[PDB]
Amino acid sequence: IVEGSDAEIGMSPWQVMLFRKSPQELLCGASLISDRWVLTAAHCLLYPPWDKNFTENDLLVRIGKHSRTRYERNIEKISMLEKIYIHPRYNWRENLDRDIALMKLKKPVAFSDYIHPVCLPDRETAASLLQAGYKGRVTGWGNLKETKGQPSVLQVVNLPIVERPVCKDSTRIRITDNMFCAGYKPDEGKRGDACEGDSGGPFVMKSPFNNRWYQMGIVSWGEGCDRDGKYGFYTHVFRLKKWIQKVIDQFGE
Amino acid sequence: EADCGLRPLFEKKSLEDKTERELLESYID
Amino acid sequence: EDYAAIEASLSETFNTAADPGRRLGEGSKP
Ligand SMILES: *[C@@H]1O[C@H](CO)[C@@H](O)[C@H](O)[C@H]1NC(C)=O
Ligand code: NA
Numbered sequence: 001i002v003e004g005s006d007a008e009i010g011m012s013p014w015q016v017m018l019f020r021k022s023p024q025e026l027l028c029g030a031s032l033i034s035d036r037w038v039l040t041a042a043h044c045l046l047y048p049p050w051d052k053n054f055t056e057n058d059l060l061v062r063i064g065k066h067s068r069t070r071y072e073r074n075i076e077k078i079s080m081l082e083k084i085y086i087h088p089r090y091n092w093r094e095n096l097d098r099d100i101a102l103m104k105l106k107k108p109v110a111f112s113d114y115i116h117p118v119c120l121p122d123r124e125t126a127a128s129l130l131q132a133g134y135k136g137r138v139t140g141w142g143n144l145k146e147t148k149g150q151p152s153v154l155q156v157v158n159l160p161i162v163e164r165p166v167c168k169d170s171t172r173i174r175i176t177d178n179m180f181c182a183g184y185k186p187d188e189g190k191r192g193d194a195c196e197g198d199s200g201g202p203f204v205m206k207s208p209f210n211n212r213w214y215q216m217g218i219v220s221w222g223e224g225c226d227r228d229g230k231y232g233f234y235t236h237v238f239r240l241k242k243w244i245q246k247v248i249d250q251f252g253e
Numbered sequence: 254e255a256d257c258g259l260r261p262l263f264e265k266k267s268l269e270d271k272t273e274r275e276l277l278e279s280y281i282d
Numbered sequence: 283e284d285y286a287a288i289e290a291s292l293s294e295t296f297n298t299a300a301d302p303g304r305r306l307g308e309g310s311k312p
Contacts, residue, residue: 010262011270026298034254047302069294078284096303112261119258135279137272143298147311150298158275173307196301206276212258223309230308 001140002226003192004157009066012139014118014215015154017062018044018200020054027054029140029201031215032063032117035108037248040200041218041235042090042101049092056081061103064114066153068141075114082106085247087240097176099220099235101200102247118202119214126238129205129216132163136182136205136216138232142197146225157192159183159203162231170231171223178239179220181231193232195225203234 016030016038028044038061045054064076082104091097109115121129129136139156143149159182167181175181182203184190194201203217217234224230237244259265305311 005272008270010260013260013262020299024293024296026296028299028301033257041303043303044301050300050302052302069296071289071292071294073286073289078289095306099303111256114261116259116261117254117257129280133279135276137276141298142301146304147300156272158272160279171307196304197298199301199303206273207258208277208280211264213260214258219303221303221306223304223307225304 001138001142001151001155001157001192001198002145002195004155007066007139007154007156010113011156012154013064013114013116014202015065015139017065017141019060019062021058021060026068026141026197027059028197028199029142029219030061030103031202032115033120034117034253035111036105036253038103038105039215039218039244040101040103041099041220042086043092043096043099044200045084045101046086046090047092056084061105063109064112068151068153077109077115079105079107079109083251085251087243095173095176096221098178098240100218100240102244104251118204119212120241120244121214121216121238123238125207125209125214126216129207129214130161130180133160134205135160136203138194138198138201138203138219140194140198140201140219142199143195143225145195147196159192159232167231170229178236179233180217180236181233183231186228191226193222193226194219
């Protein structure tokens with residue numbers, strides 16, 4: 001996260017760390033959506049140009065974390081994956097369209113002060129909150145600036161959603177309906193962006209209707225981090241909600 | 254989950270984090 | 283495999299992997 005701040009304890013209890021077994025390394029962020037299921041970005045798992053193709057046994061997820069590096073005893077939970085499901089039409093060749101993946105834990109994880117699932121948006125919640133100027137929140141342990149710059153604890157930044165045609169005109173990459181962008185504009189004075197290692201983490205908004213946190217986006221892509229006139233792009237979770245439900249139903253709640 | 258999106262250390266205790274107000278403010282003004 | 287104390291095999295000093303999501307288009311790096 002560029003230009004964010006340290007998270008408060010328990011601020012984002014759905015935040016998941018995707019951790020490589022060998023060699024040990026932070027891969028990506030992710031989010032807990034039930035006691036068995038974790039949502040992340042497809043490109044965190046599969047990116048053929050870099051020969052990236054992680055399977056279930058290559059990875060672990062770490063849940064309930066605050067410190068980036070320390071084993072947080074009696075706080076974090078470490079789970080192995082039973083299965084990974086990547087969207088069939090994920091588009092690694094061009095713009096990471098449908099940059100979404102689901103991971104099923106081998107065993108259910110117990111909830112606590114530090115571990116708690118986020119909500120997925122319904123139609124009305126998405127229609128209400130996904131509007132230009134409305135801010136969502138992004139969290140992660142990714143780099144503090146465009147490429148050490150590694151944070152010691154979880155970072156958080158609040159960012160305004162941007163109008164589709166501004167997102168459109170800001171980049172030469174083809175934008176689809178399955179993405180939205182966010183961040184401040186050059187003239188807004190404030191700044192901030194997700195950055196490397198934040199991918200697959202959640203973009204969340206707090207609903208004024210029921211005071212629940214909903215995951216509207218998945219940190220997906222950008223051209224560098226925090227450049228003036230550039231914005232961060234997020235997988236549109238509601239647009240993909242049907243596929244998420246299909247997978248969970250078919251492969252076990 | 255019927256309990257999703259409600260944080261044990263915040264919503265469940267009627268506490269707000271240091272910046273969630275910023276989100277709500279953006280929805281209103 | 284794991285219980286509580288045996289996580290002394292867990293590194294507390296590790297890198298963050300290169301993230302291709304930030305290297306699209308003008309984000310390219312050498
Ligand atoms: C990724 O790797 C797995 C295991 O080596 C392999 O079975 C699978 O076909 C690969 N996926 C593709 C098509 O890149
Ligand atoms: Na920017």
